Write an enzyme that holds these catalytic residues in place. Structure first.
Site, PDB file in Angstrom:
ATOM      1  N   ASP A  35     -60.464 -38.268  90.029  1.00  0.00           N
ATOM      2  CA  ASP A  35     -60.251 -38.724  91.286  1.00  0.00           C
ATOM      3  C   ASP A  35     -60.145 -39.885  91.341  1.00  0.00           C
ATOM      4  O   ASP A  35     -60.694 -41.227  91.447  1.00  0.00           O
ATOM      5  CB  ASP A  35     -61.180 -37.789  92.033  1.00  0.00           C
ATOM      6  CG  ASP A  35     -60.601 -38.202  93.396  1.00  0.00           C
ATOM      7  OD1 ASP A  35     -59.130 -38.424  94.088  1.00  0.00           O
ATOM      8  OD2 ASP A  35     -62.126 -38.219  94.728  1.00  0.00           O
ATOM      9  N   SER A 199     -44.128 -48.031  97.225  1.00  0.00           N
ATOM     10  CA  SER A 199     -42.352 -47.369  97.319  1.00  0.00           C
ATOM     11  C   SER A 199     -41.771 -48.091  97.283  1.00  0.00           C
ATOM     12  O   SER A 199     -41.880 -48.471  98.443  1.00  0.00           O
ATOM     13  CB  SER A 199     -43.139 -45.516  97.523  1.00  0.00           C
ATOM     14  OG  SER A 199     -41.542 -45.217  96.927  1.00  0.00           O
TER      15      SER A 199
END
Length: 330
Positions: A35, A199
């Site tokens: 994770d 992004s």
């Protein structure tokens, strides 16, 4: 040093991925959920409430000759999906794909929430976010990567998640055969303890690319792709019959649809998520309504590049003095 381990989806939907981990002496092998959105390595154990164990493989510290109780240490964690676990702490030897850390904090569960009990294929989590998020008290503990870092050939690990198929986690090296073209690196903020990046935008299907900054985290422990409501609405508007359902809890679409791809930007580069990756199947057995793999982050408070996005790429988690993230097509 290096390590290399295969990671395998737990079910036909890629709801999560498990990776074999050796703990203790003799080795006890548990299948852990790696994770990059958390920083605790915790396991089902011999100490876990009996009623809360249903099929998982447990860690039994008393059978490990290298296990030592970390006196007075406890842990307690809550995840973004509302699940939780807690217990006490041992140090022991932990090996991943040939890479060994001695003295790793192994957090032993006394209690786990129902979602964990109900998932017989996940024996625990191995956190790969920044150690600042580790919940051990009163002495915070380091992650497996953090403990390994100095020994590694290069201070990196990589995630190569498969679509309905096995993939790979590598530690300490970059497999140049595992991706196409070049790796594009982008800045990371460690300020929230996550692999947080920005992004450069997105496209839907064959549509034109929209330049816009989307701040989010690279999180292997989250199944889906969570993005701003504007972005998500633009995607599902291209699917006839798709709608947001409060009763189901997200966007659903007719199972007879053909999904468009979704592209996200990494600097000047582009990663394309095929439409098939965004299909998570009937909302209930036999339903013709299917659950979408791109959902709104509104009300999460952060954007999450989960497995839906990450499995479309070869992803480098660069733990140099100044951490960065790298993405390549594959």
């Amino acid at each position: 040093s290096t390590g290399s381990a295969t990671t395998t989806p737990i079910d036909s939907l890629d709801d999560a991925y498990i990776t074999p981990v050796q703990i203790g002496t003799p080795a006890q092998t548990l299948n852990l959920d790696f994770d990059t959105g958390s920083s605790d390595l915790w396991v089902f154990s011999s100490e876990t409430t009996a009623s809360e164990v249903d099929g998982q493989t447990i860690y039994t510290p008393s059978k490990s000759t290298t296990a030592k109780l970390l006196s007075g240490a406890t842990w307690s964690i809550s995840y973004g999906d509302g699940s939780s676990s807690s217990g006490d702490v041992y140090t022991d030897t932990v090996s991943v794909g040939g890479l060994t850390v001695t003295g790793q904090a192994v957090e032993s569960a006394k209690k786990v929430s129902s979602s964990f009990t109900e998932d017989s294929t996940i024996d625990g989590l191995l956190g790969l976010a920044f150690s600042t998020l580790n919940t051990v008290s009163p002495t915070q503990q380091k992650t497996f990567f953090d403990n390994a870092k100095a020994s590694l050939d290069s201070p990196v690990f990589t995630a190569d998640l498969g679509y309905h198929a096995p993939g790979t986690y590598n530690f300490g090296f970059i497999d140049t055969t595992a991706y196409t073209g070049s790796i594009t690196y982008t800045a990371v903020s460690t300020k929230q303890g996550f692999w947080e990046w920005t992004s450069t935008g997105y496209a839907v299907g064959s549509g034109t690319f929209k330049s816009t900054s989307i701040d989010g985290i690279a999180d292997t422990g989250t199944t889906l792709l969570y993005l701003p409501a504007t972005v998500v609405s633009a995607y599902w508007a291209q699917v006839s019959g798709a709608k947001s359902s409060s009763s189901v809890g997200g966007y659903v679409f007719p199972c007879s649809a053909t999904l468009p791809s979704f592209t996200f930007g990494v600097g000047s580069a582009r990663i394309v998520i095929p439409g098939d990756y965004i299909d998570f199947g009937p909302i209930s057995t036999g339903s013709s309504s299917c659950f979408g793999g791109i959902q709104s982050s509104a009300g999460i408070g952060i954007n999450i590049f989960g497995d839906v996005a990450l499995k479309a790429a070869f992803v480098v988690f660069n733990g140099a003095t100044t951490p960065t993230l790298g993405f390549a097509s594959k």
